[PDB]
Write a protein that binds this ligand. Structure first.
Ligand SMILES: Nc1ncnc2c1ncn2[C@@H]1O[C@H](COP(=O)(O)OP(=O)(O)OP(=O)(O)O)[C@@H](O)[C@H]1O
Ligand SMILES: Nc1ncnc2c1ncn2[C@@H]1O[C@H](COP(=O)(O)OP(=O)(O)O)[C@@H](O)[C@H]1O
Ligand SMILES: Nc1ncnc2c1ncn2[C@@H]1O[C@H](COP(=O)(O)OP(=O)(O)O)[C@@H](O)[C@H]1O
Ligand SMILES: [Mg+2]
Ligand SMILES: [Mg+2]
Ligand SMILES: [Zn+2]
Lengths: 277, 595, 359, 137
């Protein structure tokens, strides 16, 4: 069972978006996931069963749509693309070729773009005899004055990366930063949900407004960055989760303007243990 | 109808009771007391599974594994013996070693069903004691005759029986109306409790397990929530697990519970149950002999915490606190305190915590707390909760549980004003007042307090007056009967000696001390004497009219403190009156503490 | 955890461990085994060996408990590899919890109590201090944490119990644990012109609790820098992955799992006890130390930032017993006390950087 | 993967990987029951290895003995009818086992973004009880 809501863009001014229920059968299941706009060809019919007509009030009936066809209104490759990859690699100046192709809708900031390239590619992890771990993910921090397109850079990273998860220390976000045991509003079942850090394992986590963060979020960031694993002990559940991810953050200086007369450590509210990582 | 196996088992248990004679005289004693005192004692006796095993192993295993067939015969045999030996039915309880039948709610599984078990745990919630109707009596107006009826249910016996759901009679056989006789009917009490795994034995980070218990008649009000309990009973199953009728649901199984027949409260550290011991004539003779020696106070004081070096005066003070004074109530209704309080301030390596934990371990009823560990409601019991009956009531806190006992507070100086104001009332009025939505009550909190705190500047400084080093409100200091200041000053000989003492350690007994304090606190109540009156008057006058700078202020609380110390020393002496020597000892100790 | 441990050993394992114990170079082999991928810090590694071994606990007739664990503090300049040691100790000890001040994400640092989601009843939700019972707690950033946590940890490190008192539950728990803590100085670098008490960022009395203090400074030196750089690039190249490790495993190095099993075996089996000669020597040393400190204090007009107390005496006792234990010897001779005093002088008595200690 | 289970796997054998998040308390079920008819005292037994108690007395269909036919009638013309559900269980002579429920959920790392994870219910009994604790993979 799926629920379709009118696309907000098309609603004429002053009214509300309507919604309907849809039934998918056989091989039509798990073809569309939440957040995508779809076209459905199907049959419109009542809930003829209802419950029963002994109910008091007017005799109204509910309706549904039985789906027959569904359509949407990738990173895989092949040999043809692999040969082209090798051809392009064999060319000289490929590094600058790539760097010139990041966030084309922003002017300048070559250092920013090359840092983003490095962090988006990443190194190779190492482990000596399975007793000495070395991380391979590259972390970058942006610290700039207002009106510098840091949010645009982060949005481009989200749109381009294979597994990017967005979050913020202030504002509305689809996910937080701390793992928790929470009820399921529809299935009424307890569920264990990790933060964006856990969700973006072997990926990239983007954090907006990095300096407006509270104690719990700061502690979670510190743990994830230092150990790349998040512990949890809640609701009788004791365990640890992998959080191997690359972090990209944006912040603003104290007072909203950078003070070039002082060291960077005193231009921001963060602290050395987090800054050094 | 009569059963041959039943008769054989009855006769065998009769032979057991014949060979063992203690239970016979115990029953005779119960009947003697009940006859003489008419309070009434119940008809119940305790049997030893070890003796049963030694006598008849087959019968022992029969009781252990299939109680439903072996207990009722024994109960009938006991009833017969009592009714024969005298000039209700009687009941049995079991003690001894249960072997593999001593379990906990976590390790209690279906394979134990219908078997006698002994569980340990913590009581989580008790139920309201309700009467149960057994026999109803009625009167007929048209005929002037009294009728009656009897009732039963599934939980009143171990063996299954065919249900006989008799109805409540409102009419006569001929059609006459009937009138109930509440005064001639019969009712029996009934309660249900829940037991849970102890918190000091359950795995950390895992949800706990629990089991229900049913109690009837005279085992109905033997415990309270938050207590440590060992219950010996019969693990049983009732009803049909949805088998009868369609009952399409398959998730639910068989209802189970324990028809408990023995309940024992257990003592533990920082728990609401007071520890008590049984005193033998040998114990009493030894205590009374020891009473007559002159250095009894010295030997007793030195006996405490021998692992620590020195602190002789502090040990004396702790012993005085343990023994305690006497509290007075006047016909008017006024109350005069009789407890003592101790505060220690010292350098950060002076075994303060060691002494505090020793007191926690030795005192019969002591509760331990840290500075910020418990705050707000946790101390004053001011929390309010409710059951599904709809009523709200209170559930006790630290000091409320500590009634008639001791409270150890560690890191005292980290507390806050909001709860120091609360503890003022506890130290002085020895009472707690709560006024919340729908609750206005007053709870007794007669407890003593021992606390430790650190100086402001890390180490006590002699270049500054005591106020700058202590920094606590004078009103609060006035409430503590005794205050001590302890510093570690480097000295070659003292360091040497403490070194040998500590190395010796790293390579009178406590139980007898506990028996001694129990007897002394339970038996002796001294009175004041004119000699002590004069001595204390003189000492208080001198202290109030001297110019020396003291570590604490002076009020009438100091005079009351002199009284309390004199009375407690007399209690130690086991004399029925305070004496000049006790007064002088109290005065000397207070003078040493202040100077 | 402590509720799912194994207390039975195979005969072959027992024989192998006895043969390994009889080895005369066992101490050096273990020291080399601890974190071979870092350069230097032999004293630190030896201290970690002693910590993992742990001392011997005593129960007295009056009930007083003399703990047998060891507490270590690592003050140091930034980036001295003082966190990798924490992580490796966590990874190698049988029961270990690594956490920072203020706990971990959705995981408290100390025993916590809440009502059952279903039955509304009390139960321990978690807490590292009780989860790691019988093991090691690796506390990072020890200088940032709340006062309630400070008090609870202070009680735990000495009495090895946590007392709980709330509106409907009162009990004393068991938290037998060993504390390895790491902290950074204020201002971003240790300053030689100020006392370590001023370099730390909390009550200086806290330093009285730990058994060892290691103050590691990042001095600048061309050849040392070159050597460390060569070591690090070798590690990254992976040549060090084979050399040293894969050869020294043939006699002069121990596998991590085998060392873990050996630690468990020694803990379960041995429990040394001193000898009178060691006792007298220790007493004389302690008296001399305190006499010197008193002389310096009386000469000066201020109090020192690194006091000497009976805690340090007990720490020395625990260290000598720890050294004796790993040989499985049921007694400790003055040969152990010599090493114990050397280690103590190397680690704790770096209070020579303290002003009224100078003299 | 837990997200690929579908109709085709119904009643087959499958292998799954996940993390335990909740375990219920031990239940009780019967494996051998002794039952009696409350009216005519006809006894019998049942063995399990949705079983329900007999709806009607079996002493009629079970013509045990010739005298049983006489015993099945008496007091003139009144037919013998024990009623519906006349059987009761005798608990002193029955045997029970242990049953338990578990929940298994996909590893949180691989969940699709913007959707809560999927979980599933499992039933175990006898010697597969008290083997794991929540949080184990
Ligand atoms: N160099 C630039 N070239 C083009 N557009 C820019 C540039 N710098 C800023 N902008 C635009 O100006 C506006 C600045 O807001 P934006 O959030 O993108 O900036 P920011 O640097 O992240 O600052 P903040 O989050 O403090 O507002 C956006 O429209 C951004 O697209
Ligand atoms: N007078 C003493 N005699 C013997 N041992 C002592 C003495 N004072 C301190 N100690 C030792 O020093 C340690 C002090 O621990 P603790 O009680 O936590 O310190 P404090 O009570 O000063 O806070 C104890 O382990 C104890 O064995
Ligand atoms: N003596 C050393 N030998 C080898 N590597 C070192 C050494 N000192 C520092 N490192 C390197 O520094 C990193 C550890 O840094 P970090 O743990 O942040 O320092 P700290 O623990 O002092 O905060 C490791 O990757 C390690 O390779
Ligand atoms: Mg922006
Ligand atoms: Mg202390
Ligand atoms: Zn029948």
């Amino acid at each position: 069972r799926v629920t379709l809501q009118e696309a907000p863009g098309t609603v004429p001014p002053g009214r509300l978006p309507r919604h309907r229920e849809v039934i998918l059968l056989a091989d039509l299941v798990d073809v569309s996931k939440p957040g995508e706009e779809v076209e459905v060809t199907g049959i419109y019919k009542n809930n003829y069963d209802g419950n029963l007509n002994a109910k008091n009030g007017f005799p109204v009936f509910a309706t549904i749509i039985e789906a027959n066809s569904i359509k949407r209104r990738v990173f895989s490759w092949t040999e043809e693309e692999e040969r082209e990859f090798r051809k392009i690699s064999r060319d000289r100046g490929i590094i600058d070729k790539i760097i010139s192709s990041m966030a084309p809708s922003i002017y300048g900031h070559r250092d920013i773009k090359t840092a983003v390239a490095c962090s988006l590619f990443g190194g190779v992890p190492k482990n000596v005899n399975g007793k000495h771990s070395i991380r391979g993910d590259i972390n970058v921090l942006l610290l700039g004055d207002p009106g510098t397109a840091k949010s645009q850079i982060l949005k481009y990273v989200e749109k381009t990366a294979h597994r990017a998860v967005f979050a913020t220390g202030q504002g509305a976000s689809a996910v937080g930063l701390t793992a928790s045991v929470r009820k399921d509003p529809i299935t009424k079942e307890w569920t264990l949900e990790g933060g964006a850090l856990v969700l973006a394992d072997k990926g990239v986590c983007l954090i907006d407004e990095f300096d407006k963060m509270n104690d719990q979020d700061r502690t979670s960031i510190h743990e994830a960055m230092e150990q790349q694993s998040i512990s949890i002990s809640k609701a009788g559940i004791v365990t640890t989760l992998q959080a191997r991810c690359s972090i990209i953050a944006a912040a603003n200086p104290n007072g909203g303007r950078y003070n070039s007369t002082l060291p960077l450590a005193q231009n921001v509210s963060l602290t050395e243990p987090i800054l050094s990582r | 109808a009569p059963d041959a196996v039943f008769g054989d088992r009855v006769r065998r248990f009769q032979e057991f009771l014949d060979t063992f004679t203690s239970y016979r005289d115990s029953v005779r004693s119960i009947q003697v007391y009940n006859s003489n005192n008419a309070n009434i004692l119940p008809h119940r006796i305790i049997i030893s599974l070890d003796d049963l095993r030694e006598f008849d192993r087959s019968f022992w295993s029969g009781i252990l594994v299939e109680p439903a067939y072996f207990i009722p015969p024994a109960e009938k045999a006991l009833t017969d013996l009592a009714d024969s030996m005298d000039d209700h039915p009687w009941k049995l309880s079991f003690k001894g070693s249960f072997g593999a039948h001593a379990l906990s709610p976590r390790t209690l599984t279906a394979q134990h069903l219908n078997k006698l078990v002994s569980v340990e745990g913590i009581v989580t919630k008790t139920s309201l004691v309700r009467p149960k109707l057994i026999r109803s009596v009625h009167y007929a107006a048209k005929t002037g005759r009294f009728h009656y009826r009897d009732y039963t249910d599934a939980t009143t016996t171990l063996t299954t029986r065919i249900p006989t759901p008799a109805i409540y009679p409102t009419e006569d056989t001929e059609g006459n109306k009937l009138t109930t006789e509440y005064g001639y009917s019969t009712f029996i009490d009934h309660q249900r409790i829940t037991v849970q795994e102890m918190p000091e034995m359950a795995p950390a980070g895992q949800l706990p397990r629990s089991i229900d218990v049913i109690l009837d008649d005279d085992l109905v009000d033997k415990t309270k929530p938050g207590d440590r309990v060992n219950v010996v009973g019969v693990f049983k199953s009732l009803g049909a697990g949805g088998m009868n009728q369609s009952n399409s649901n398959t998730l639910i199984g068989f209802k189970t519970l324990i028809l408990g027949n023995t309940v024992y409260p257990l003592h533990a550290r920082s728990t609401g149950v007071a520890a008590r011991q049984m005193l033998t004539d040998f114990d009493i003779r030894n205590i009374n002999k020891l009473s007559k020696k002159k250095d009894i106070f010295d030997i007793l004081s030195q006996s405490l915490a021998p692992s620590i070096y020195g602190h002789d005066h502090i040990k004396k003070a702790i012993l005085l606190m343990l023994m305690g004074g006497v509290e007075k109530n006047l016909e008017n209704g006024s109350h005069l305190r009789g407890d003592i309080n101790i505060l220690m301030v010292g350098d950060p390596s002076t075994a303060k915590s060691q002494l505090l934990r020793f007191v926690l371990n030795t005192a019969s009823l002591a509760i331990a707390t840290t500075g910020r560990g418990s705050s707000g409601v946790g101390l004053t019991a001011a929390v309010t909760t409710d059951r599904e009956t709809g009523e709200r009531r209170l559930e006790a806190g630290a000091m409320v549980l500590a009634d008639r006992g001791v409270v150890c507070i560690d890191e005292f100086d980290k507390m806050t004003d909001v709860d120091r104001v609360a503890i003022h009332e506890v130290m002085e009025q020895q009472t707690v007042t709560i006024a919340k939505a729908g609750i206005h009550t007053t709870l007794n909190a007669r407890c003593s307090v021992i606390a430790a705190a650190n100086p402001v500047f890390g180490q006590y400084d002699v270049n500054r007056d005591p106020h700058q080093n202590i920094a606590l409100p004078d009103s609060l200091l006035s409430r503590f009967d005794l205050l001590f200041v302890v510093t570690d000053d480097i000295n070659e000989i003292r360091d040497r000696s403490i070194s040998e003492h500590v190395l010796r350690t790293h390579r009178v007994t406590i139980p007898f001390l506990r028996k001694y304090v129990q007897y002394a606190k339970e038996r002796v109540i001294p009175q004041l004497t004119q000699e002590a009156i004069n001595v204390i008057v003189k000492n208080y006058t001198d202290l109030r009219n001297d110019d020396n700078t003291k570590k604490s202020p002076i009020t009438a609380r100091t005079l009351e403190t002199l009284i309390r110390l004199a009375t407690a020393h007399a209690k130690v002496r086991l004399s029925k009156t305070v004496n000049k020597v006790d007064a002088k000892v109290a005065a000397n100790l207070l003078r040493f503490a202040l100077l | 955890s402590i509720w799912n441990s194994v207390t039975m050993f195979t005969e072959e394992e027992e024989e192998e461990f006895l043969q390994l114990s009889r080895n005369p170079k066992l101490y050096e082999i273990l020291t080399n085994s601890i974190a071979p991928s870092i350069f230097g810090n032999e004293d630190i590694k030896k201290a970690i060996v002693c910590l993992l071994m742990g001392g011997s606990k005593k129960i007295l007739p009056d009930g007083m408990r003399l703990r047998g664990d060891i507490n270590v503090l690592l003050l140091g300049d930034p980036g001295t590899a003082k966190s990798q040691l924490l992580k490796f100790v966590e990874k190698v000890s049988p029961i270990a919890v690594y956490t920072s001040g203020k706990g971990s994400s959705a995981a408290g640092l100390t025993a916590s109590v809440q009502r059952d989601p279903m039955t509304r009843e009390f139960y321990l939700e978690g807490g590292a201090m009780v989860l790691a019972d019988g093991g090691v707690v690796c506390i990072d950033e020890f200088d940032k944490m709340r006062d309630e946590d400070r008090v609870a940890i202070h009680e735990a490190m000495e009495q090895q119990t946590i007392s709980i008192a709330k509106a409907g539950i009162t009990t004393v728990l068991n938290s037998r644990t060993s504390v390895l803590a790491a902290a950074n100085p204020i201002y971003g670098r240790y300053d030689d012109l100020k006392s370590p008490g001023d370099n730390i960022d909390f009550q200086t009395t806290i330093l009285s609790r730990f058994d060892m203090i290691f103050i590691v400074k990042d001095d600048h030196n061309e050849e040392r820098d070159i050597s460390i750089a060569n070591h690090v690039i070798n590690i990254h190249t992976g040549n060090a992955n084979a050399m040293q490790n894969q050869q020294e495993e043939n006699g002069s190095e121990i596998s991590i799992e085998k060392m873990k099993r050996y630690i468990t075996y020694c803990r379960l089996k041995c429990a040394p006890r001193l000898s009178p000669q060691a006792a007298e020597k220790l007493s004389s040393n302690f008296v001399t130390i305190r006499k010197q400190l008193l002389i310096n204090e009386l000469e000066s007009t201020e109090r020192s930032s690194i006091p000497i107390t009976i805690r340090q005496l007990e720490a020395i006792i625990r260290i000598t017993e720890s050294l004796a234990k790993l040989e499985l010897s049921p007694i400790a001779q003055e040969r152990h006390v010599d090493e114990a005093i050397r280690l103590f002088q190397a680690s704790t008595m770096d209070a020579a950087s303290q002003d009224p200690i100078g003299g | 993967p837990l997200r690929d289970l579908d109709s085709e796997h119904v009643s087959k054998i499958v292998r799954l990987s996940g993390i335990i998040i909740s375990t219920s308390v031990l239940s009780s079920r019967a494996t051998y029951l002794s039952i009696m008819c409350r009216n005519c005292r006809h006894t019998t037994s049942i063995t399990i290895n949705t079983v329900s108690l007999p709806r009607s007395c079996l002493s009629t269909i079970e013509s045990e003995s010739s005298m049983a036919n006489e015993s099945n009638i008496g007091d003139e013309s009144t037919k013998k009818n024990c009623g519906p559900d006349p059987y009761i269980i005798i608990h002193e002579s029955s045997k029970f086992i242990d049953q338990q429920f578990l929940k298994l959920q996909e590893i949180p790392e691989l969940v699709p973004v913007g959707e809560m994870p999927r979980n599933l219910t499992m039933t175990c009994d006898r010697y597969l009880t008290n083997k794991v604790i929540p949080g184990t993979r």
